[PDB]
């Protein structure tokens, strides 16, 4: 009776092992394509910049379709129109971070709240220090840290996202499944800026740090994290 | 039955004693003396008890009969164990496991019989 | 047969203006007055040597009247030779402006 029942336990253990190894090969190779895809977009913008300068023209790049919004002002004394947007972007604490894609609904939400936030377009590396070091997942309405690839694959795995690089490529390259990817990530609990801020109250144009940090946000991200 | 009478005894028994942040129960045949559903010497059909012998040498082990209830004069049977302190534990171990007699108190009865044997010996040098 | 410790002054506790944190102490080793040259004293053992009335034991010698509170230098403080030290027990606050011994035997260079 147990002679063939022994084969039941060992074969099913073997079936999961090859199944785990088959998925392990998929994680490795999709990331290899993504490294080629990240080298694809970085180099092809250098391709387009030089050729317009070869002739007497200019290559206007597209404004990136994702920005990183950081609330830099506290919750005391906040206008209700301002307060509603901050809880609609999941920015309830000071120095909280979230990913927001760019469309006419988004900037018009962002252009009413710039004294209370500091937002800008992040770099490719700047995503990595957020997803890996501060990446927390909203699983069953619980802030669960991303310590294994199985966590993402069960809430977005039937969407095509099952690992870090599947999540990062869905974040960095704003694809057509982006909405639940930002919903999966908890708003980032960024630490206080090491080295200090210039001025919290005023906009970035006159030497403050509020408003659109369109390029220099990558300097500030390394101070938060 | 067993679950029915546990909900009555659990809070208004004469053996219940709380007394500054613990809970105990001092009825006979209750090894580990906890006021718990598993560790109760009266509500069960099968009951295992360990209690030191009357002469101060050995352990008398008390079993419930399971054949006739409501007759406490003949419901419990006592057997005396007085051996070389290794077969003393082995005899009680065989009364539980080999007889399939309410086995969750197998090891806890051995624990109680182990501590009794250090009471019936010289203690201080 | 000489001195094996550096001269160090207990200048006060870690504080702001209206608050004072007693668990961290500010030290002035005479000789160092710059930020880039406080790296030598980082992690060095610091001891506040005093004496009392009753007799206490002493390792490797006869019981005498001197007692200490052992400590350790945590990190630098405000680019002036000021440096922070943490003791096992907080200072009695009667040693402000009194010289304590910071040692070298927790050395690395």
């Amino acid at each position: 009776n147990f002679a063939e029942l022994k084969i039941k336990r060992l074969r099913k253990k073997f079936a999961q092992k090859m199944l785990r190894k088959a998925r392990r090969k998929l994680i490795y190779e999709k990331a290899k394509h993504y490294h080629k895809e990240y080298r694809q977009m970085y180099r092809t913008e250098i391709r387009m910049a030089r050729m317009a300068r070869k002739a007497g023209n200019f290559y206007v790049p597209a404004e990136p379709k994702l920005a990183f919004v950081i609330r830099i002002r506290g919750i005391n004394g906040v206008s209700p129109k301002v307060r509603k947007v901050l809880q609609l972007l999941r920015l309830r604490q000071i120095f909280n971070g979230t990913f927001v894609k760019l469309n006419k609904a988004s900037i018009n939400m962002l252009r009413i709240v710039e004294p209370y936030i500091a937002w800008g377009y992040p770099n490719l590396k700047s995503v990595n220090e957020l997803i890996y070091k501060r990446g927390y997942g909203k699983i069953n309405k619980k802030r669960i840290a991303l310590t294994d690839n199985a966590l993402i694959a069960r809430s977005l795995g039937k969407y095509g996202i099952i690992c870090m690089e599947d999540l990062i490529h869905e974040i960095y390259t704003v694809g057509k499944r982006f909405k639940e990817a930002n919903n999966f990530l908890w708003p980032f609990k960024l630490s206080s800026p090491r080295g200090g801020m210039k001025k919290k109250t005023t906009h970035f144009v006159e030497g403050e740090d509020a408003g659109n940090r369109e390029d220099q946000i990558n300097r500030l991200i390394r101070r938060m994290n | 039955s067993a679950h029915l009478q546990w909900m009555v005894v659990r809070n208004c028994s004469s053996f219940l004693i709380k007394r500054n942040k613990q809970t105990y129960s001092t009825e006979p045949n209750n090894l580990k003396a906890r006021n718990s559903f598993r560790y109760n010497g009266l509500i069960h059909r099968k009951t295992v008890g360990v209690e030191p012998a009357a002469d101060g040498k050995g352990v008398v082990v008390v079993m419930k009969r399971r054949s006739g209830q409501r007759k406490p004069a003949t419901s419990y049977v006592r057997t005396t164990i007085n051996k070389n302190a290794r077969a003393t534990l082995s005899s009680i171990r065989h009364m539980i496991r080999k007889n399939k007699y309410h086995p969750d108190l197998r090891m806890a009865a051995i624990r109680r019989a182990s501590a009794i044997l250090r009471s019936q010996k010289p203690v201080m040098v | 047969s000489g001195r094996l410790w550096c001269k160090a002054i207990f200048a006060g506790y870690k504080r702001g203006l209206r608050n004072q944190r007693e668990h961290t102490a500010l030290l002035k080793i005479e000789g160092v007055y710059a930020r880039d040259e406080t790296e030598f004293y980082l992690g060095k053992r610091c001891a506040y040597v005093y004496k009392a009335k009753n007799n206490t034991v002493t390792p490797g010698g006869k019981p005498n009247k001197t007692r200490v509170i052992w400590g350790k230098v945590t990190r630098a403080h405000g680019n002036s030779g000021m440096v922070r030290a943490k003791f096992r027990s907080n200072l009695p606050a009667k040693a402000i402006g009194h010289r304590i011994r910071v040692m070298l035997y927790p050395s690395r260079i």
Binding site: - | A85, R86 | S1, G2, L4, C6, E37, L104
Partner: protein, 216 residues
């Protein structure tokens, strides 16, 4: 049956192999290396034969017990730890031992032991210091070296030799080891001038001398 070869890939970075596993497949040559497919002892008693039992069940049990603890993975004991050395501390250099009873004495370094304690020996004639152990942290390493490479350090002395047993009397082996080392190292320091007097002097801080300022 097979002689155990060493690791083929060199250590590029700790935890990183230089070759990939696909290249390692060629190196290990697995392409052509595929495969497919007590307690009771009988003793005679002068009755019959008795079957005794080893590791018999205990005669006593305590009232309550701790459960087992969770399994840590990197928590190696002291004997298996890796032992490092400073770049300044090289065999032959002059050291400054502080925390010992030989306070501030200038004492000559010989070699590192298995436990990590430094075999350090300033000549008994000069420093009155025997074959003695010190810790790396509690030593100032002066930048003064000697050509100590051509010496024959005895092999019998080790961590077990300098370990405290339990009045302490100097053994004859300790004196013999001291003379054997002294015959080796003392003529060498005599060749370089002013170092034997340097050893006899004691290190001490004075007024206007700050350890972060001067160099050693």
């Amino acid at each position: 049956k097979g002689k155990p070869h060493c690791s083929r890939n060199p250590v590029l970075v700790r935890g990183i192999g230089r070759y990939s596993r696909s290249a390692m497949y060629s190196r290990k040559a697995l392409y052509k290396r595929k495969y497919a497919a007590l307690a009771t002892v009988t003793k005679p008693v002068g009755g019959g034969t008795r079957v005794v039992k080893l590791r018999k069940m205990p005669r006593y049990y305590p009232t309550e017990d701790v459960p087992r603890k969770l399994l840590s993975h990197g928590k190696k004991p002291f004997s298996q730890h890796v032992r490092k050395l400073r770049a300044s501390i090289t065999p032959g250099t002059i050291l400054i031992i502080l925390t010992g009873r030989h306070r501030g004495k200038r004492v000559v370094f010989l070699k590192q032991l298995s436990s990590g304690l430094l075999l350090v020996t300033g000549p008994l004639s000069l420093n009155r210091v025997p074959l003695r152990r010190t810790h790396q942290k509690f030593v100032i390493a002066t930048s003064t070296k000697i050509d100590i490479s051509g010496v024959k350090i005895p092999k019998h002395l080790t961590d077990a030799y300098f370990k405290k047993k339990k009045k302490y009397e100097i053994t004859e082996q300790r004196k013999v080891d001291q003379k054997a080392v002294d015959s080796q190292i003392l003529p060498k320091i005599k060749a370089v001038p002013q170092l034997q007097g340097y050893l006899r002097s004691v290190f001490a801080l004075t007024n206007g001398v700050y350890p972060h300022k001067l160099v050693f």
